[PDB]
Design a protein around this ligand. Structure first.
Ligand SMILES: Nc1nc2c(ncn2[C@@H]2O[C@H](COP(=O)(O)OP(=O)(O)O)[C@@H](O)[C@H]2O)c(=O)[nH]1
Ligand SMILES: [Mg+2]
Length: 173
């Protein structure tokens, strides 16, 4: 619950296994596309203005990673976070299981006061006949972990991107 110029402001941190699509989520959400160019391991934190209810919110968006120096820097990203997106890829069951084994506990340790939103990324990839994570599985995990919501999204297909960040704003304001 911050106010930075005259605009309500929110800090959102994005966490989850490598390659679940965290950097693409932020690029697609804020830039409206994923550029054909070298995608960085971690996007430096930045502010994005989002027009929502009928007002403007300033979102302070923090990408994170677990490779190279970013693994060591990650804990420092959490301070004063209002919302944490717990991200996995729906076609990667390992990443889903790690929400419970690694990511939710890490968040509870460093920033228990943050609200969490469970985010099922790469939903464009879900298909019958594999062991892809279902919407019911995401809903159940959200329930067990006390997240505010489970939201499915695709950066590539532009599905659910605004919903993720609109729900983030909603649970704070
Ligand atoms: N099909 C599909 N692929 C995606 C999507 N988002 C990301 N990817 C792919 O997943 C790879 C890893 O994404 P990235 O954002 O770098 O993952 P990060 O390590 O969690 O930040 C990228 O090379 C994309 O090719 C998506 O919504 N749909
Ligand atoms: Mg990344």
């Amino acid at each position: 619950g911050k106010i930075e110029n005259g605009k309500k402001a929110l800090k959102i941190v994005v966490v989850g296994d490598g390659a679940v699509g965290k950097t693409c989520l932020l690029l697609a959400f804020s830039k409206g596309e994923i550029p054909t160019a070298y995608v960085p391991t971690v996007f430096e934190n930045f502010s994005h203005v989002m027009k929502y209810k009928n007002e403007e919110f300033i979102l302070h968006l923090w990408d994170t990673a677990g490779q190279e120096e970013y693994d060591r820097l990650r804990p420092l990203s959490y301070a004063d976070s209002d919302v944490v997106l717990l991200c996995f890829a729906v076609n990667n069951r390992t990443s889903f299981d790690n929400i419970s084994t690694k990511w939710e506990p890490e968040i509870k340790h460093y920033i228990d006061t943050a609200k969490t939103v469970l985010v099922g990324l790469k939903v464009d990839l879900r298909k019958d006949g594999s062991d892809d994570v279902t919407k019911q599985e995401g809903d159940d995990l959200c329930q067990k972990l006390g997240c505010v919501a489970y939201i499915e999204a695709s950066s590539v297909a532009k599905i659910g991107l605004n919903e993720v960040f609109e729900k983030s704003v909603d649970c704070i304001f």
